[PDB]
Amino acid sequence: APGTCSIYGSGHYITFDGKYYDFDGHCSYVAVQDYCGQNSSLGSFSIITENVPCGTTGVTCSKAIKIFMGRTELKLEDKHRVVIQRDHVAYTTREVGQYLVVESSTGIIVIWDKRTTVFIKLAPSYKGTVCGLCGNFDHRSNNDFTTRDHMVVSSELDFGNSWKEAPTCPDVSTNPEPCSLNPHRRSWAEKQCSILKSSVFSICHSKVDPKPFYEACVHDSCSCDTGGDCECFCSAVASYAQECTKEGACVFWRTPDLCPIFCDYYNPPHECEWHYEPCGNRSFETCRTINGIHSNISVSYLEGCYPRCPKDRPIYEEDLKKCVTADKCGCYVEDTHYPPGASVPTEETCKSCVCTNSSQVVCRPEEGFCYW
Ligand SMILES: *[C@@H]1O[C@H](CO)[C@@H](O)[C@H](O)[C@H]1NC(C)=O
Ligand SMILES: [Ca+2]
């Protein structure tokens, strides 16, 4: 029973609690934090999305995600996870299918597709104790629009604006209407996006209502008018797929003509490792699934290109893109991978260290005084 916030395409949001709503601000904003009480200082983590305008109609798209876990700051930007400041909470950074996943010992998962979409998973412990654009995760939709000042509002725009992180950003006064703005895109938009209501997604229509996702798929196909509309369309179908695969109803919607994916590209010369899985596979073992964070909270189900490793080397080792035996993974220290044999660094005195040929990190003193 975790909660999931979604932020995708050109300004669409799904609170932990099931409220769909659009908001298009050109600022950084608080997707969710637990600094939500009366005290400035009382809380743990904030997750920020930096949004930018995308297209000419005035909509805005998510471009980066900032993660604060206590005094630690991470950014997801330019297809990377980069570290801005660190002193220590534990997090691990895996690539999973299409996505890039940051996972923390404290119940927090960020799932990012390296473009406009992010999912945020919180462990059930956080119920009630969060706030921001994702709501407060208390099973009640009616009340997610709580301003940073603890007032309830009906206005999408007041809500969103009160969760801006830099006060010099201007406020939003209007919610753009891209299809009326760009009627010459209405037809293509409604045709492509009509897959979401078609037979292909039949099984999911019991579990997830496709109206909001269809409407945002059209929104975006009209608003992506500067280049690259097929990525806005495909992103928008994929967000729906996800909710399905979550709520049980994995759909194989991709085809060579519609939103093709090129997993075969990653295959070496005479091999057939890499393959598209539309629902992941739950028993996917990587070197980082085994030696990093192990939360109750599942990410296996994401679509992407996955490798198939042999019996003789069942464990995919992300960092060197090779298959290996569990004991030849290497070492992880502060989410940094050292291979067997490599030397592991040490802000400690007279103490040298090594990652062994068995994926353990062990240290040795140096008597050059200092001893055992
Ligand atoms: C909470 O606010 C009080 C003042 O209301 C302040 O003394 C305190 O340092 C703040 N943070 C805490 C107690 O962690
Ligand atoms: Ca709520």
For the chain, what is the domain count?
A: 4
Same domain, yes or no: 238 and 294: no
Same domain, yes or no: 47 and 154: yes
Minimum-distance ligand to the CA of 5? Answer: 2
Using the atom order of ligand 1, give the atom closest to the CA of residue 41: 11
Domain around 133: 3-162
Distance 42 CA to ligand 1 centre (A): 7
Breaks (C-N over 2.5 A) in the chain follow: 87, 368
User: Ligand 2 being an ion, which residues bring their Cβ within 5 A of it?
Assistant: 17, 135-136, 138, 140, 143-144
For the Cβ of 38 lying below 6 angstroms from any atom of ligand 1, the answer is: no
Same domain, yes or no: 76 and 92: yes
In a domain, 50, yes or no: yes
For the Cβ of 41 lying below 6 angstroms from any atom of ligand 1, the answer is: yes
Please tell me what DSSP assigns to residue 124. G
Strand order in the sheet with 3-8: 20-22, 12-14, 3-8, 118-122, 108-112, 99-104, 91-96
Minimum-distance ligand to the CA of 41? Answer: 1
Distance 41 CA to ligand 1 centre (A): 7
**Residue with CA at minimum distance from ligand 1 atom 3:** 39
* C-alpha to C-alpha distance for 64 and 52, rounded to whole angstroms: 9
Same domain, yes or no: 40 and 148: yes
Same domain, yes or no: 105 and 189: no
Same domain, yes or no: 78 and 196: no
Distance 86 CA to ligand 1 centre (A): 24
- Exp. method: X-ray
SS (H, E, C) 171-232: CCCCCCCHHHHCHHHHHHHHHHHHHHHCHHHCCHHHHCCCHHHHHHHHHHHHHCCCCCHHHH
For the Cβ of 42 lying below 6 angstroms from any atom of ligand 1, the answer is: yes
* C-alpha to C-alpha distance for 220 and 54, rounded to whole angstroms: 10
